[PDB]
Amino acid sequence: XXXXXXXXXXXXXXXXXXXXXXXXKXXX
Amino acid sequence: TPNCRVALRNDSYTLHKILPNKVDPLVSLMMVEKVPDSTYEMIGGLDKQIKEIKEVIELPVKHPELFEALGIAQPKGVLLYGPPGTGKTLLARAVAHHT
Amino acid sequence: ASKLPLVTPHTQCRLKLLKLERIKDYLLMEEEFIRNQEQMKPLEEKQEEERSKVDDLRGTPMSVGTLEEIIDDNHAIVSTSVGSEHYVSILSFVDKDLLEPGCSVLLNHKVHAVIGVLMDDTDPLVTVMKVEKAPQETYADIGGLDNQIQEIKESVELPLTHPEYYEEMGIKPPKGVILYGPPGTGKTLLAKAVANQTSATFLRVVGSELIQKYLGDGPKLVRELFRVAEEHAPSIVFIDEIDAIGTKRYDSNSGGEREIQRTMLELLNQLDGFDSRGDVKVIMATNRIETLDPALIRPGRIDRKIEFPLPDEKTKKRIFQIHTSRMTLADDVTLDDLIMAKDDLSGADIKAICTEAGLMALRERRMKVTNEDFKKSKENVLYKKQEGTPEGLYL
Amino acid sequence: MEEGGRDKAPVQPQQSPAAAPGGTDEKPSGKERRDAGDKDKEQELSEEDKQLQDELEMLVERLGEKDTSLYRPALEELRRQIRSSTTSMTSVPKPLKFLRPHYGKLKEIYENMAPGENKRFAADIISVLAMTMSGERECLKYRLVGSQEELASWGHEYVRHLAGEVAKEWQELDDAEKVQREPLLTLVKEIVPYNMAHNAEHEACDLLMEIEQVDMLEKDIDENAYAKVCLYLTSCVNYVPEPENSALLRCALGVFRKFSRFPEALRLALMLNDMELVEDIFTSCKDVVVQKQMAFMLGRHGVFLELSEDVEEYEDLTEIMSNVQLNSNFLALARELDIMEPKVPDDIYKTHLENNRFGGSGSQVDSARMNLASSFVNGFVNAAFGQDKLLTDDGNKWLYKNKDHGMLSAAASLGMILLWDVDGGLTQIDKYLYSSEDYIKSGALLACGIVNSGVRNECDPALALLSDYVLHNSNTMRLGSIFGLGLAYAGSNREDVLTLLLPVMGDSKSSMEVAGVTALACGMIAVGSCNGDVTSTILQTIMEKSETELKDTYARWLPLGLGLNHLGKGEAIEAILAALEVVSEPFRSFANTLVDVCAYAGSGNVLKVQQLLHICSEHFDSKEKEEDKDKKEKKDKDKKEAPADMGAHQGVAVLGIALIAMGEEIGAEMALRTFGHLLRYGEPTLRRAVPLALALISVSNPRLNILDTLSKFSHDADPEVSYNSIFAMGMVGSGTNNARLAAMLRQLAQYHAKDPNNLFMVRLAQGLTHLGKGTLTLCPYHSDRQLMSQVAVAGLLTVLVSFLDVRNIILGKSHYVLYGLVAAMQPRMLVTFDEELRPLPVSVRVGQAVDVVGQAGKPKTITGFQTHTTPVLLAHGERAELATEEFLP
Amino acid sequence: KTYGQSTYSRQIKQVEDDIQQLLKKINELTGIKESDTGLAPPALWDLAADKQTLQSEQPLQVARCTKIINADSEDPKYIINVKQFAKFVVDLSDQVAPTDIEEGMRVGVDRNKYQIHIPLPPKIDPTVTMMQVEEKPDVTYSDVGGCKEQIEKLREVVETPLLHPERFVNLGIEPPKGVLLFGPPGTGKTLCARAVANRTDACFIRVIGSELVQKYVGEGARMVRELFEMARTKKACLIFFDEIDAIGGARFDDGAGGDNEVQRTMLELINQLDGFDPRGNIKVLMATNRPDTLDPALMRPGRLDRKIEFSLPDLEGRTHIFKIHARSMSVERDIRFELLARLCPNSTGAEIRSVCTEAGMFAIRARRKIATEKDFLEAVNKVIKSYAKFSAT
Amino acid sequence: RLEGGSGGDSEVQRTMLELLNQLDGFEATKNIKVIMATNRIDILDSALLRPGRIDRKIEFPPPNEEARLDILKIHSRKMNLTRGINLRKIAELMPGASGAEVKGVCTEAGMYALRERRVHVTQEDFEMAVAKVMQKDSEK
Ligand SMILES: Nc1ncnc2c1ncn2[C@@H]1O[C@H](COP(=O)(O)OP(=O)(O)OP(=O)(O)O)[C@@H](O)[C@H]1O
Numbered sequence A: 001x002x003x004x005x006x007x008x009x010x011x012x013x014x015x016x017x018x019x020x021x022x023x024x025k026x027x028x
Numbered sequence B: 001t002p003n004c005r006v007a008l009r010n011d012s013y014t015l016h017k018i019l020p021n022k023v024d025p026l027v028s029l030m031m032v033e034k035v036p037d038s039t040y041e042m043i044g045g046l047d048k049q050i051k052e053i054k055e056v057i058e059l060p061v062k063h064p065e066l067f068e069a070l071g072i073a074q075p076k077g078v079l080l081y082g083p084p085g086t087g088k089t090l091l092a093r094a095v096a097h098h099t
Numbered sequence C: 001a002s003k004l005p006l007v008t009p010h011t012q013c014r015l016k017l018l019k020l021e022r023i024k025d026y027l028l029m030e031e032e033f034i035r036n037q038e039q040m041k042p043l044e045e046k047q048e049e050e051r052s053k054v055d056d057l058r059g060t061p062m063s064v065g066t067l068e069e070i071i072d073d074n075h076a077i078v079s080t081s082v083g084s085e086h087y088v089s090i091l092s093f094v095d096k097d098l099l100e101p102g103c104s105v106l107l108n109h110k111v112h113a114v115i116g117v118l119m120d121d122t123d124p125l126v127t128v129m130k131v132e133k134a135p136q137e138t139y140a141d142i143g144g145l146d147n148q149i150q151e152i153k154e155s156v157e158l159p160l161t162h163p164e165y166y167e168e169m170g171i172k173p174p175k176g177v178i179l180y181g182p183p184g185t186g187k188t189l190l191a192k193a194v195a196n197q198t199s200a201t202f203l204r205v206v207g208s209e210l211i212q213k214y215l216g217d218g219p220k221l222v223r224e225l226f227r228v229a230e231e232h233a234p235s236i237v238f239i240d241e242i243d244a245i246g247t248k249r250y251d252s253n254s255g256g257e258r259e260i261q262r263t264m265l266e267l268l269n270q271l272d273g274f275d276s277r278g279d280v281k282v283i284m285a286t287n288r289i290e291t292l293d294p295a296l297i298r299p300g301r302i303d304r305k306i307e308f309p310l311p312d313e314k315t316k317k318r319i320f321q322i323h324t325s326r327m328t329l330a331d332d333v334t335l336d337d338l339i340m341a342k343d344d345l346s347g348a349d350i351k352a353i354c355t356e357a358g359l360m361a362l363r364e365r366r367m368k369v370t371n372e373d374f375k376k377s378k379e380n381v382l383y384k385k386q387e388g389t390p391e392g393l394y395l
Numbered sequence D: 001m002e003e004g005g006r007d008k009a010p011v012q013p014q015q016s017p018a019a020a021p022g023g024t025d026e027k028p029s030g031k032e033r034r035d036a037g038d039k040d041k042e043q044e045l046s047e048e049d050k051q052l053q054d055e056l057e058m059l060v061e062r063l064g065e066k067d068t069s070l071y072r073p074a075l076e077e078l079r080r081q082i083r084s085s086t087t088s089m090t091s092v093p094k095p096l097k098f099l100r101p102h103y104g105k106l107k108e109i110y111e112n113m114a115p116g117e118n119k120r121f122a123a124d125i126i127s128v129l130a131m132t133m134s135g136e137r138e139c140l141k142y143r144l145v146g147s148q149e150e151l152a153s154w155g156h157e158y159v160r161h162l163a164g165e166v167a168k169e170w171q172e173l174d175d176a177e178k179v180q181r182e183p184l185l186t187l188v189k190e191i192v193p194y195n196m197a198h199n200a201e202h203e204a205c206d207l208l209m210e211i212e213q214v215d216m217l218e219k220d221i222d223e224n225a226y227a228k229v230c231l232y233l234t235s236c237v238n239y240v241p242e243p244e245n246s247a248l249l250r251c252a253l254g255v256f257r258k259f260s261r262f263p264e265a266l267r268l269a270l271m272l273n274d275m276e277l278v279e280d281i282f283t284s285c286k287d288v289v290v291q292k293q294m295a296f297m298l299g300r301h302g303v304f305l306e307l308s309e310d311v312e313e314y315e316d317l318t319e320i321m322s323n324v325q326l327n328s329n330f331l332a333l334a335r336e337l338d339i340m341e342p343k344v345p346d347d348i349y350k351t352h353l354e355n356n357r358f359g360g361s362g363s364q365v366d367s368a369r370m371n372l373a374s375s376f377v378n379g380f381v382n383a384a385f386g387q388d389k390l391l392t393d394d395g396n397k398w399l400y401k402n403k404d405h406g407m408l409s410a411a412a413s414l415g416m417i418l419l420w421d422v423d424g425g426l427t428q429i430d431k432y433l434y435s436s437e438d439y440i441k442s443g444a445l446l447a448c449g450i451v452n453s454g455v456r457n458e459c460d461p462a463l464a465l466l467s468d469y470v471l472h473n474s475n476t477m478r479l480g481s482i483f484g485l486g487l488a489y490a491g492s493n494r495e496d497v498l499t500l501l502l503p504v505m506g507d508s509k510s511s512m513e514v515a516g517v518t519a520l521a522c523g524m525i526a527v528g529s530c531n532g533d534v535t536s537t538i539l540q541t542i543m544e545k546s547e548t549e550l551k552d553t554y555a556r557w558l559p560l561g562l563g564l565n566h567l568g569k570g571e572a573i574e575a576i577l578a579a580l581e582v583v584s585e586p587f588r589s590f591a592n593t594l595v596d597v598c599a600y601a602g603s604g605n606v607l608k609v610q611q612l613l614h615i616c617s618e619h620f621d622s623k624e625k626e627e628d629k630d631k632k633e634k635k636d637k638d639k640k641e642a643p644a645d646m647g648a649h650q651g652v653a654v655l656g657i658a659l660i661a662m663g664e665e666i667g668a669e670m671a672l673r674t675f676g677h678l679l680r681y682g683e684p685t686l687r688r689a690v691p692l693a694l695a696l697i698s699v700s701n702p703r704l705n706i707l708d709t710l711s712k713f714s715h716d717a718d719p720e721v722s723y724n725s726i727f728a729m730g731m732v733g734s735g736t737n738n739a740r741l742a743a744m745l746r747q748l749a750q751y752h753a754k755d756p757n758n759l760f761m762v763r764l765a766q767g768l769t770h771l772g773k774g775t776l777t778l779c780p781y782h783s784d785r786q787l788m789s790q791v792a793v794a795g796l797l798t799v800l801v802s803f804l805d806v807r808n809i810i811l812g813k814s815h816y817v818l819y820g821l822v823a824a825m826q827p828r829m830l831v832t833f834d835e836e837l838r839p840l841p842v843s844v845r846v847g848q849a850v851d852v853v854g855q856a857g858k859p860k861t862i863t864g865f866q867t868h869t870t871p872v873l874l875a876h877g878e879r880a881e882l883a884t885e886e887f888l889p
Numbered sequence E: 001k002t003y004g005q006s007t008y009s010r011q012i013k014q015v016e017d018d019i020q021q022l023l024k025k026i027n028e029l030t031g032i033k034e035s036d037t038g039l040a041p042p043a044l045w046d047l048a049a050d051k052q053t054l055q056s057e058q059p060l061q062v063a064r065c066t067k068i069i070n071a072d073s074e075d076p077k078y079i080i081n082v083k084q085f086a087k088f089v090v091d092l093s094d095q096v097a098p099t100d101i102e103e104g105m106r107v108g109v110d111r112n113k114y115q116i117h118i119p120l121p122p123k124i125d126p127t128v129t130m131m132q133v134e135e136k137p138d139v140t141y142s143d144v145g146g147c148k149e150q151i152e153k154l155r156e157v158v159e160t161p162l163l164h165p166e167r168f169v170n171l172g173i174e175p176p177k178g179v180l181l182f183g184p185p186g187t188g189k190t191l192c193a194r195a196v197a198n199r200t201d202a203c204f205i206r207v208i209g210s211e212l213v214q215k216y217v218g219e220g221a222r223m224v225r226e227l228f229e230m231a232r233t234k235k236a237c238l239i240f241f242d243e244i245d246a247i248g249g250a251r252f253d254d255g256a257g258g259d260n261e262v263q264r265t266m267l268e269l270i271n272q273l274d275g276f277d278p279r280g281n282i283k284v285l286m287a288t289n290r291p292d293t294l295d296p297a298l299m300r301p302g303r304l305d306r307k308i309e310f311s312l313p314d315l316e317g318r319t320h321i322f323k324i325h326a327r328s329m330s331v332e333r334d335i336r337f338e339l340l341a342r343l344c345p346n347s348t349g350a351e352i353r354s355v356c357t358e359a360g361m362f363a364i365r366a367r368r369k370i371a372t373e374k375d376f377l378e379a380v381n382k383v384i385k386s387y388a389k390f391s392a393t
Numbered sequence F: 001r002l003e004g005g006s007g008g009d010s011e012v013q014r015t016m017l018e019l020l021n022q023l024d025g026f027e028a029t030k031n032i033k034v035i036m037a038t039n040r041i042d043i044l045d046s047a048l049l050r051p052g053r054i055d056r057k058i059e060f061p062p063p064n065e066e067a068r069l070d071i072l073k074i075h076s077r078k079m080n081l082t083r084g085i086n087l088r089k090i091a092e093l094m095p096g097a098s099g100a101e102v103k104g105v106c107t108e109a110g111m112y113a114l115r116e117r118r119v120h121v122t123q124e125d126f127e128m129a130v131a132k133v134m135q136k137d138s139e140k
């Protein structure tokens, strides 16, 4: 009877992937 | 079928093959249709309540024609109430055997 | 589809006879022109050629997004399944007319452009509150009102079924109707009887279920109720039992009763403040009438107030008949033993008698009907009233 | 169901009418006193209308129908009073006694004898006794009589006066909204003899009311927005004397009998122009009636007000002719330099600024035919006093650089710069005239006819351009000299300079483009008489077009001025005249569809609309009469702009489905010029459905056909948010949709909506709906765009200065004698009110509120308040006089 | 069985009925493509489907939207989050000018090289979009007849500075930036609200008072911020409150455990109304039925200046409201209304219009085409008797 | 009811609306009753469920000596117990015990049988278990 409330958060997860055939030099 | 697993390509997202249902979770926990035994009329001390259940459940089942002659509907839902463990479970267990 | 918007003679004037036969001519000739397309060049130009141009234009995997906002004509903002938002342009393949915010879409991979729309489901709130079908008995159930029937018919039914008389004089129908009287009279019956024989949608609301233990949800349920009722259809909103939820500002207290005041204050504005709601029929039912807030009672909100009295010996002879119309009747009974005697008892008491006689007979496992069934049932319904009565002798 | 016991009337009126043949013979008192005791009682049980169920009228005829069938005929000795008791009682339930074949036998009870004065027992009752039944009489019974036997027996003779009092009764019971039910009676009764019905109803209306004129008054013109041809011929002259005889509102004469000018008789409105010259009290209604007579629907009136009162009451004529036109110049001089405009905006071309960074760099477009559009950055924006000293140097260099037709075009653009001018318009041409070139002078001297257009004073009736024309042994001195003067004297029907320019037709000097625009020039002048024009044109037509089977320079220019000389009459005589005149081969019977429907600008005649498609529907037609079905569709474009939104929705429903989707050449080449002719304001139905066939050019065809539909999709003036549609199409149209052929065209389309800020009124709808042609100036262009090869040579005469009949824009002016009042005006969306609860909220978009020169717009009916009484004309028309009066505290 | 109501009753009907049936049977005969799980009908995208869709494929981009935190010196060097992807330090592309890229702005950024292309309008949540009215009802000042003093006071305050900012300059005053309206119900509060929203020449913003009470704490305050932020952008806008008793009337503290969250929301309305950096051009109208139990912080002038009350006029407003409501209907020319107004001395304009709508029912209780004076006599015969023995009165 | 209504629908009342949907659909019992037994009786939506759907309510009092003796024999049925015992004294040492408390006694008697290292269950096991559970029942 007439009572407020606060809240909360449930953050999702995250993930990434690639073909992984890229070289990272290009320097020299 | 709806709610059915499928095999899916990672590139074109095409279906390959219907995967089988693992179990049917309702029909894996399908509720038991176990044997309706009574412990009999020897739940004495409750006999007034026993006479009520006979006249609201057994009397529609045993005597449909008293309702068919007089023209009144047969009941289908009975509510029981009291403190817990006073035979809410075990009495309707018995009546399903008496019929 | 929206072929010609003119209706303005609205009678048997010769103008409508000329206009609609022009519309008959422009439609026959458009048909007879296009009938001579599949006669002389009967080509199938766009069976798959329209489709295979576009199914190859869109990607084969489709992805469902969500609308957030709409900007000028082609580019709008969307939301992916994770929250990444894209400012992509829509194509002229999707119905732009049913494209409102809060809807699922179909997207692309590279440019993520909006390709199509997925149709919506049915909201649960209609399935909660709407009496979906014609529920119960028609006007063969009611016992001889014939004036209260006449008022509700020309306030709701005859406006809805045959609107032609109001628009002759340009006079709008009255808006609100209060049903009131002693309890057990047939207030719920008359709502369901009009809900039986109707052509528009009907909404039943129990007023006692409008008090949440949270707060703000009082006005929240109200502002969504007329929102659904407006957006759905021609609608008739019935709210039973407003007497013990919206009475008055009796002490101007706080702690819950102030919240109940705020719910009725929203309902008062949501009933009628701004931009007259249109094709919304409001019917309200009470037991008590005196302790009601007069800001609801004033015209502009409710215009019809109908008393529900109790007949004494005349309509009861059918109410006793209708409740005994589907049952047996041995020849030892006369309904005039009870109709002629007492003159105040409700129609709900009559149903309480006509069921109890069926209870007393089959409990003792007997045959059809005795007089002593109706004797003991009438005696019982007295105690069904009297055992909750504190009355002594002349107060 | 509580019946039985209280059924008094289902017993004794069931018995005594059954005892009426049991008491007709041998009972002389029971035959009549039980008849009178029944007749008053059923009349008593019928006058109250709270019970549609009557306890006899749905009860007695279970036997009373077979009773009356054996009581009324079978008595055969019907006396003088027992007929006034039988027929007065038994003619009442007969619409409900009988079923739907009552319509031949509303007479076998009633017309035995109509008993006395039937409204004696039918006065207070609304429609239940006989008023619906009298409409059931006049529907079927009088019409079979009045189909070929109007002059007949009792079925017309008493029926005239019987309907004569019922028509009074609609304004007698309560004077309801069923005043308009009396035209539901007067039109259904004697449909073609409506005037014989109206003549009794004119004088009955003359003594009816002076407050209850106006809604039936507008109901007549509601019924006169369209009709049958003879009905539209009939009720519109019946419409005329009701503000003349009953009321003297009488300021709705000159424009709302231009309604009745062309149908009934041209002299009849001239007799009403004489009726203008009768009601000469005093000036204020008089001045505003004659405001419209110059440049609002017609001119040619400057010869009838030089009679014996030439002091101020007839010295309004020249003030009407050019001085309020100079006050119409004082609009754009004073009031429009105040609101927005300095002399050179110039920057819609500069609004193409962000294109050079969209995709790297720019400076790629070097097409010399874009320089044609480079004149219109100067050209279109300088209308309404955009005068330019050395701001024409983009013209002045390009006048002396190349492009002979653009030397003609840049010189012809100067006339649009000094528009509606007589004061110094020739002074501006003369310094740019003397270059001694065929293309510069004939562009400049053609622009001289543009400057003095609408003036029709002494500027050059035979002075300048006739001296220009006689110089001919050559090019456009031969051509461009006849065009400007016929443009300048289009609104007149002067005969003399027509006969100065009839030997242009009679020369037979075979310059084909000169004789083609000659029929365009003379056609702009006259619309009625002078059959010698129709003689002179077809003489050279049989000389030249018979000895050819070639280009539409023959076809788009010569039969058109014929239809310009016979525009606007649904008589179907001019079709009998012109089509039997050029009985000929089908490439010369291309001209069949021209003068047929040029007389059919707007009415309701869908029997012509069915012969407008059913004859030449498709036929699959291997490139023979494809132009004939194009021009047949061209005449579908009119008869649609003025049924007042009635066939307009029907036109967009047909042509969006029938032609452009499932047609071959009629749709995919030509069928978009409807939208370049029907609607002139733009709404997102057609403004979006056309780039749904225009952004897709469908380049397989000669794509300038669809790019022709690019250009006059921007034939919607009154500037909008549609810069997004054109500038994005100009961005895709730079590289693709190549600039060799349309770089003029897209920017011609771009610069046209913002012609000026104002002066867009080209709709051919004045007051509320009358034409004001107008049509003679526009329709040359949409006929001209068929299809190609005039984007380079011949159409540059046309495409610049074809339509030049914009009448001005706005209605915010007050003109109380000093011209100092502003107003308290109130602009709104257009009216919807036709017949509802009197009086009526006239419009709906009341939120906007201005006081002074604010705009016109397409759907607007602007009113006022503050009790200034606005008492002038009560329709509208943009020079309200606005006297003042406040006798209301 | 039945009868003709007016002459050719079915004869016009089925002519209209079958052609609406035929407008269907056109389309399936042509071949119609409907209900194809969310597409467009084929008659208008077949000439859209081709290469001016490739003009939207290859030249157009995706342009992922973002949010700006701040700027740097001598150069843009903007710090920007996406939403939940990563926060970046990125630069504008060359198609913009570095002027309207102020902080706290939703902007669209290229997906490949992460560069700014388009500035976007900010996030306005729809719950306050649905209270901007965006249309104006047709209510004339003449329709609120009987209130010559009350409209004239309210004309002076709401209307006249917004349409004549001249006289207040030439005398050197400040207009009373807030007005309260009150009185007995059904008297014309909402009429004047609609009539000013008619002639507003402004961004009129509706507010229902109970839309602020919510379930969570502080979010009811966050509405009031977004109102006064759009108010400072939409210059010279009007804001209408209604039934402000729900927004808060008292500061009940004897047992301070009752209502608190409405008090916090009401205090937020106090600060953004007046105090610390005034609002400029915003006028506020309020309307309640009990203007007695309000917090005197609202009653301070500067906030609520004029207390206009609405009474039951005298005897002649009723005759004029008769001439407002019973001008617009179809009656007999034998009107008189001093006879009518003397029969109902204590009545609201709602009770006036209830009679005029009741009067049309008697003609439909009968079977008439009109409204007779004697019928309107019989209309005012019953409603005197109806109001004498009414249920609540 | 609609307490967890428009604020998320909570998935459970939507199932209850499908319970009401089928019972509205057709039974006429046909051969099948449904039985439901509850405490906390005054919270649910029975007023909509009174007409036709469900029916008469039956009260359960606290038990008695002959009731608890029968409840003792039923819940001590599935055991390996030893005879030579007065169960009626065991039932009459409990003045106001509930039937669920009887089930806890039969566990403790089997627990006392376990610490005997016996599969006998004697009278000594119950007489201490009744004293133990009633000691656990000695809070109010
Ligand atoms: N002075 C008046 N002139 C014309 N109509 C009036 C007048 N007073 C009331 N009415 C009519 O009464 C109706 C109610 O008016 P309004 O909505 O302003 O009441 P209210 O003041 O909003 O009531 P509450 O105080 O309960 O909110 C209006 O629709 C209006 O048509």
Ligand SMILES: Nc1ncnc2c1ncn2[C@@H]1O[C@H](COP(=O)(O)OP(=O)(O)O)[C@@H](O)[C@H]1O
Residues within 6 Å of the ligand: C141, C142, C143, C144, C182, C183, C184, C185, C186, C187, C188, C189, C319, C322, C346, C347, C348, C349, C351
């Ligand atoms: N005139 C009548 N005809 C038939 N049954 C009636 C009549 N009046 C009352 N009843 C019986 O009494 C009950 C009336 O319901 P109602 O009076 O609307 O309850 P409440 O007023 O408390 O909502 C119905 O169940 C109906 O069976």
Ligand SMILES: [Mg+2]
Residues within 6 Å of the ligand: C273, E189, E190
């Ligand atoms: Mg209000």
